[PDB]
């Protein structure tokens, strides 16, 4: 048609509404462009201090999630009383009132029978308003089993930062000022925790930073790095330890942070012990003990023998980092540390951030800035009855705290979740049976290693309800489906992000009229359930909500579901917009201004803030982790054994002092290498919004943005050497088999794969979720499910599931 006249043109006149993306834990602040009531575009929120308008490519896929043609539009109940991968649930639609009636009756029955602990709440993704549904509702019912997904995420990645410098959490990386970047498996222009900001800065940074990427595959980041080290899976700590060794021999640790020998002369000579009293540490603790007990023998030649890395390369890297200090940052990914002995890879790699002074330094890395965001609703102790008070003391269903499951989050025996092991406890009714389960925003049958264990566990649960947008693999086993309003377009929430020297708090708000008969997972549904429970004689959750969760301005409780959804966010963010947050960052004049800007930014990070005041046992950066010794001693004393016996029970090689210092743990491996000659290198797709874009056609259309991969396919990548060895050609249908399972996909020969490994994206292999993600919904998958290959194994010190290093596979055609 003719071009439209100016008064009738539409380009640029629509409305932008702020929200937050959750395709990864970058949790970017966004704006949604809306015209004719439809969301048409996503862009980074320009007011964001972390990332600005910069975005990774997955923001656009969000539009095929809210407008996913396989979303649920109604609650449902299954009519096949049998559950199983082979059992069609025969879901039929029901009302919200009927669905919550069914769930409510089952919860109350538990309480009447004095078995409230047989209730479980499973949390996958979430927002910072989760405290009500996740914790308070669960404890008021009377259960200790609020089970997050943290241990199938990255808890092993927190072990180093916590037991060395007191941060049970992540770091931001000061790429703009870095002079040396050493990445153990991290691929920050594709995954990790600020893809938008690190993509914004990576290429520019190459003009002032020397970048080394250690990864069994040639990642996007490695392809834009000065050196790709194609490490054998599970051998990362060998390089990290040898770098530290050379640093001491060459005398190039960062003396303003670490200290120096009292008499100036460098006494660290390879293989020879040093007097502890000859060195004066400044902000660190344990350098000489670490040297004497292990590091003195972790030579470049020792490292070269294990890894094949040229010792001259090890030496040169160590010297380059010394000269760049303190503008030195060492990244660890899940790949390096989510292994059965991976706690000590986190420790060994992160120790380099202390040795070269990068921790809390310009060009280094440090934690997120402080913000006044509230993370919990008021305490619920006064609303706990005797039934609830007794139930919450029961052992958790994931067995955390047992001798072989220390899960030492924040230094506490049994302190951490063990997500994947909850399936085993349910499976075996140990400590007890789970009879009623509520789960939201999660798909553990698909996302947990050896997820068939979740198939089995859920088939044995009397009543389960799943809060979800799509009928995913986990949903297949539900008695009741409770369809969620989509988190990014139809929900009130609040999130945070760190990077660029700041922490930001961002809003989630509805940008479209709600499409279907859905409810918001973390607010409306617990609200409606509390009402139903109160109708049936258990009004403690309802009383807690109505008396404790009231508007920060009016003091009044919510009048209805929609008001409550917004109130949940208003309550926790009131310190940002009702009070003066100037001490921490932006000053906001009102709730409306917060919503319009969509984001609150902190002030820039004060470098060296934590120097001399780490939240460790010594308050120092601990090369010899007295913090970890204390936690292990606590666990040992609890079980009337020695620490060495804990190490043995947890299948670690460390004994004596080695339990507390950076040291080499031979990587755990499962299976006969002669039968299973290839090591799996699991990776994420840079178009994965976690496990939630496999039903997006645009995902497949551009799937080859993953280096080496193939559009509209699921491929496993083999080095051409192994392709010739196993008779594989590009496009061949292949079966990959491990000791615990198998999958089918297609073969791709690619030189960016370390020989002896196979690099394959997690993310495909859905047999449910939707029509694009599956071949025949409920029956036959599209692609291959990586986690069916990955034996159920744990970094027992952290509770983390292992996804890397131990997986041996074989491959064959057809």
């Amino acid at each position: 048609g003719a071009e439209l006249p100016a008064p009738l043109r539409r380009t640029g006149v629509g409305e932008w509404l702020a929200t937050t993306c959750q395709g990864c834990t970058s949790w970017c602040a966004k704006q949604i462009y809306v015209m004719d009531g439809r969301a048409l575009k996503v862009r980074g929120n320009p007011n964001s201090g972390v990332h600005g308008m910069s975005s990774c490519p997955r923001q656009h896929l969000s539009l095929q999630q809210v407008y996913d043609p396989d979303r649920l539009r109604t609650p449902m109940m299954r009519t096949n009383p049998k559950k199983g991968r082979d059992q069609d649930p025969k879901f039929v639609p029901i009302s919200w009132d009927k669905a919550l009636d069914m769930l409510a009756d089952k919860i109350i029955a538990l309480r009447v029978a004095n078995e409230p602990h047989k209730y479980a709440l499973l949390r996958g993704r979430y927002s910072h308003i989760n405290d009500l549904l996740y914790k308070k509702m669960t404890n008021l019912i009377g259960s200790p089993n609020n089970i997050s997904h943290s241990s199938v995420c990255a808890e092993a990645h927190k072990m180093g930062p916590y037991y060395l410098d007191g941060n049970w959490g992540y770091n931001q990386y000061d790429v703009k000022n870095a002079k040396f970047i050493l990445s153990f498996g991290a691929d920050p222009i594709a995954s990790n925790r600020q893809v938008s900001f690190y993509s914004q800065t990576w290429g520019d940074s190459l003009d002032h930073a020397k970048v080394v990427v250690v990864d069994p595959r040639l990642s996007a980041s490695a392809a834009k790095a000065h050196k790709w080290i194609p490490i054998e899976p599970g051998q990362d700590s060998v390089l990290a330890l040898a770098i530290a060794h050379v640093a001491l021999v060459e005398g190039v640790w960062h003396k303003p942070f670490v200290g120096d020998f009292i008499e100036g002369k460098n006494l660290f000579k390879a293989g020879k012990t040093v007097s502890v009293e000859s060195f004066k540490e400044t902000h660190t603790y344990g350098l000489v003990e670490w040297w004497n007990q292990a590091l003195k023998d972790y030579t470049p030649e020792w490292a070269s023998k294990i890894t094949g890395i040229d010792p001259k390369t090890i030496i040169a890297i160590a010297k380059d980092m010394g000269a760049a200090a303190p503008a030195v940052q060492v990244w660890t990914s899940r790949g390096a540390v989510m292994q059965a002995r991976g706690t000590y890879t986190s420790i060994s790699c992160h120790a380099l951030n202390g040795l070269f002074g990068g921790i809390d330094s310009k060009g280094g890395l440090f934690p997120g800035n402080k913000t006044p965001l509230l993370k919990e609703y008021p305490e619920a102790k006064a609303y706990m009855d005797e039934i609830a008070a007794k139930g919450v003391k029961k052992e958790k269903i994931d067995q955390r705290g047992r001798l072989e499951f220390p899960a030492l989050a924040k230094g506490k025996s049994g302190g951490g979740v063990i997500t994947a092991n909850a399936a085993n406890g349910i499976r075996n009714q140990d400590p007890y049976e789970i009879k009623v389960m509520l789960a939201y925003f999660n798909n553990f049958n698909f996302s947990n290693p050896e997820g068939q264990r979740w198939d089995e566990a859920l088939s044995k649960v009397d009543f389960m309800a799943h809060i979800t947008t799509n009928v995913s693999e986990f949903s297949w086993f539900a008695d009741v489906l409770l369809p969620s309003s989509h988190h990014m377009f139809e929900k009130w929430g609040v999130l945070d992000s760190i990077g660029n020297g700041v922490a930001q708090i961002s809003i989630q708000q509805p940008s479209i009229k709600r499409l279907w008969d859905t409810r918001i997972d973390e607010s409306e549904i617990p609200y409606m359930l509390a009402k139903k429970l109160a109708d049936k004689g258990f009004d403690a959750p309802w009383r807690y909500i109505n008396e404790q969760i009231v508007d920060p301005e009016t003091g009044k409780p919510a009048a209805d579901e929609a008001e409550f959804a917004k109130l949940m966010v208003r309550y926790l963010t009131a310190p940002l917009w009702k009070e003066d947050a100037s001490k921490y960052g932006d000053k906001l004049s009102s709730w409306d201004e917060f919503v319009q800007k969509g984001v609150w930014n902190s002030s820039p990070y004060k470098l060296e803030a934590r120097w001399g005041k780490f939240k460790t046992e010594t308050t120092k950066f601990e090369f010899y982790s007295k913090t970890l010794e204390k936690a292990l001693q606590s666990h040992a004393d609890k079980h009337k054994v020695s620490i060495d016996e804990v190490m043995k029970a947890c299948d670690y090689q460390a004994r004596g002092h080695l339990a507390f210092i950076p040291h080499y743990e031979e990587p755990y491996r499962f299976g006969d290498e002669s039968e299973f000659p290839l090591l799996l290198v699991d990776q994420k797709s840079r178009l994965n919004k976690e496990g939630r874009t496999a039903n997006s056609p645009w995902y497949y259309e551009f799937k080859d943005v993953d280096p080496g991969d193939v559009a509209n396919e699921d491929v496993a990548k083999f080095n051409p050497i192994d392709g010739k060895k196993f008779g594989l050609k590009d496009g061949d249908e292949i079966r990959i088999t491990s000791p615990v399972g198998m999958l089918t996909c297609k073969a791709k020969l690619w030189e960016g794969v370390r020989p002896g490994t196979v690099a394959k994206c997690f993310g495909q292999g859905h047999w449910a979720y939707g029509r694009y993600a599956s071949a025949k919904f409920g029956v036959t998958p599209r692609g291959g499910s990586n986690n069916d290959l990955i034996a159920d194994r744990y970094d027992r010190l952290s509770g983390a599931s292992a996804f890397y290093g131990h997986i041996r596979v074989r491959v064959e055609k057809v």
Binding site: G1, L4, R9, R10, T11, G12, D36, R38, L40, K41, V42, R43, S54, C56, H60, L63, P69, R71, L72, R73, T74, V92, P93, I189, A190, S199, Q200, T201, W202, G203, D204, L218, A220, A223, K224, A225, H226, P230, D310, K312, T313, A316, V471, L515, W516, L687, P697, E701, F702, V705, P707, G708, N719, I721, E751, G752, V753, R754, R771, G778
Partner: protein, 234 residues
């Protein structure tokens, strides 16, 4: 006036965000991507180089697609853009054969036909493409951008060709191409190459510019500067 684009390969991370932004901006059918890429892997392990080059219409100085078009549908405008009066396209495909870059697509398929499917993976439980279409009020796909219709069919007819329009409808409003706004590293810059003071004109004097297939003689106006990778150290 000769509008063109400079793409900084050092800034580029090869993520495809530009191409996905183009999908949302221009309502291209499934499988049709005006913005796309050329990726190459070179070398034998362990000395492996991977490179990603974003591609689009080069809005050439001497466009063969214009010269062969029998109806005049494909034409140059006063900004130097190669645009198309889709209404006059008879689907002869001569432009596709004349274009050295393979950036033109032909709508052999009925655009957005997959949205006419009314089947449900869970009957009376999950929805369907057709139902979602009805719910949102969209004509062809719930993701269709009405802005596109300012100067070009929001939904093109079957049996016509189509390609990157340099987001002409956004330029008309003083706005940026979607792919330019979508790039996290600001790797993409547009401007008037006839203005010596434009950013694009200065970039290709500050850096050695590279073109795709300059030997084809079309005078492409997408220029690439710098390098996606760096020389291996150690």
């Amino acid at each position: 006036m000769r509008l063109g684009m400079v793409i900084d390969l050092q800034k580029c991370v090869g993520c495809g965000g530009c191409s996905l932004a183009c999908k949302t901006e221009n309502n291209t059918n499934d499988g049709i991507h005006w913005s796309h890429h050329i990726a190459t892997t070179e070398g034998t392990f362990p000395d492996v180089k991977y490179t990603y080059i974003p591609t689009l219409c080069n809005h050439c100085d001497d466009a063969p697609c214009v010269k062969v078009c029998p109806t005049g549908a494909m034409h140059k405008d006063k900004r130097g853009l190669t645009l198309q009066n889709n209404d006059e396209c008879i689907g002869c495909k001569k432009c596709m054969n004349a274009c050295p870059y393979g950036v033109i697509s032909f709508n052999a398929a009925t655009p957005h036909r997959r949205w006419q499917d009314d089947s449900e993976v869970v009957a009376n439980g999950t929805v369907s493409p057709l139902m979602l279409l009805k719910r949102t009020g969209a004509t062809a796909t719930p993701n269709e951008n009405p802005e596109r219709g300012d100067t070009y069919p929001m939904i093109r007819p079957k049996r016509t060709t189509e390609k990157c329009t340099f987001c002409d409808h956004r330029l008309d409003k003083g706005l940026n191409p979607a792919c330019v706004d979508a790039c996290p590293s600001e790797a993409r810059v547009i401007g008037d190459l006839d203005d010596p003071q434009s950013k694009v004109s200065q970039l290709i004097k500050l850096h050695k510019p590279m073109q795709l297939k300059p030997e084809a003689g079309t005078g492409p106006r997408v220029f690439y500067i710098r390098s996606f990778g760096v020389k291996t150290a150690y």
